[PDB]
Amino acid sequence: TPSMPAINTQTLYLAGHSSKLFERNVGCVKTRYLNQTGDWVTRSLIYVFTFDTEPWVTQAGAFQVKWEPYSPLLRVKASDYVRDNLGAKPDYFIRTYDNDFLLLSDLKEVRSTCSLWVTLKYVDRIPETINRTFYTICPDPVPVPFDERCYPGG
Ligand SMILES: *[C@@H]1O[C@H](CO[C@@H]2O[C@@H](C)[C@@H](O)[C@@H](O)[C@@H]2O)[C@@H](O[C@@H]2O[C@H](CO)[C@@H](O[C@H]3O[C@H](CO)[C@@H](O)[C@H](O)[C@@H]3O)[C@H](O)[C@H]2NC(C)=O)[C@H](O)[C@H]1NC(C)=O
Ligand SMILES: CC(C)CCC[C@@H](C)[C@H]1CC[C@H]2[C@@H]3CC=C4C[C@@H](O)CC[C@]4(C)[C@H]3CC[C@]12C
Ligand SMILES: *[C@@H]1O[C@H](CO)[C@@H](O)[C@H](O)[C@H]1NC(C)=O
């Protein structure tokens, strides 16, 4: 079966989210794998804050994730900074996933907010099936448009 992306070693990019989650001046949102200790994977949360900040500066946070096989929950132990400023929760509902995408939902909201994550394979072109699922399940879906500037080099 496909490998669960959250505990895998490929970088994940935020491709879509519910409007309510929206943070003004936050762009290029992605997560890189750092290491693993026991059942916990450590990843970074990378982004750019575009207001009154130099254009080459990347903001960075860190968090840990745990996924028991076939669990519908992703466990998240986010840093104090990430919990305080980016609203990270201790658990997320896993709607679906494949080798190169992950769709997460909030646990405690009745009108559950969502986030769609993809690997490099789909950053310039989200497959129609994933896009359709995202627009079906997610309240107030906001796509994150492709931007060349959010990547190393160009
Ligand atoms: C990802 O999906 C988006 C959502 O698609 C819409 O919802 C799905 C669940 C399904 O019902 C699908 O058929 C719907 O289109 C896509 O966005 C939609 O794209 C439409 C076409 O570009 C757009 O439409 C408008 O334009 C036509 C032009 O003739 C008008 O007739 C029509 O009335 C609309 O004004 C539609 O508005 C738009 N929806 C939203 C909410 O953005 C999106 O393109 C797709 N992306 C990929 C990569 O496949
Ligand atoms: C990808 C996996 C492995 C876990 C990620 C967990 C945490 C860090 C994720 C899950 C949902 C994410 C949020 C989803 C949507 C937005 C809106 C955007 O405007 C700014 C980033 C922000 C606010 C994200 C910040 C990081 C976030 C809180
Ligand atoms: C994993 O990364 C974190 C974050 O930088 C670090 O604190 C930790 O020492 C690293 N090593 C291991 C094996 O946990």
Numbering used by the authors: 1 to 154
Text lifted from the article:
We obtained two crystal structures of recombinantly expressed R. appendiculatus Japanin: (i) a tetragonal form with one copy per asymmetric unit (data to 2.2 Å) and (ii) an orthorhombic one with two molecules per asymmetric unit (data to 2.4 Å), both in complex with cholesterol. In the tetragonal crystals, the same dimer is formed by the asymmetric unit and a symmetry-related molecule across a twofold axis. The tetragonal crystal-form dimer and the orthorhombic crystal-form dimer superpose with an rmsd of 1.5 Å over 297 Cαs. All three crystallographically-independent molecules show the same overall structure, and each molecule in the crystals binds one molecule of cholesterol. The three crystallographically-independent molecules superimpose with an overall Cα rmsd of 1.3 Å across 152 residues (overlap computed with the program Theseus10). The main sites of conformational mobility are the hairpin loop 48–58, the loop 105–112 and the C-terminus, residues 145–152. Two disulphide bonds are observed (Japanin residues Cys28-Cys150 and Cys114-Cys138), the latter taking two alternative conformations. In the Japanin crystals, the cholesterol ligand is completely sequestered inside the protein, except for the –OH group at position 3, which points towards a solvent accessible cavity.
For example, unfractionated saliva from Rhipicephalus sanguineus inhibits dendritic cell maturation and differentiation; Salp15, an Ixodes scapularis salivary gland protein, inhibits dendritic cell secretion of pro-inflammatory cytokines; while Japanin, an 18 kDa protein recently isolated from the salivary glands of a hard tick, Rhipicephalus appendiculatus (the Brown Ear Tick), works through currently undefined mechanisms to block DC differentiation from monocytes and inhibits upregulation of co-stimulatory molecules and pro-inflammatory cytokines in response to stimuli. Japanin is predicted from sequence data to be a lipocalin, a member of a family of ubiquitous small proteins found in both prokaryotes and eukaryotes. To provide insight into Japanin’s mechanism of action, we here present two crystal structures of the protein. They reveal that Japanin exists in complex with cholesterol and that it forms a dimer, as well as confirming the prediction from primary sequence that it adopts the lipocalin fold. As was predicted from the sequence, the protein folds as a lipocalin, with an 8-stranded anti-parallel barrel at its centre.
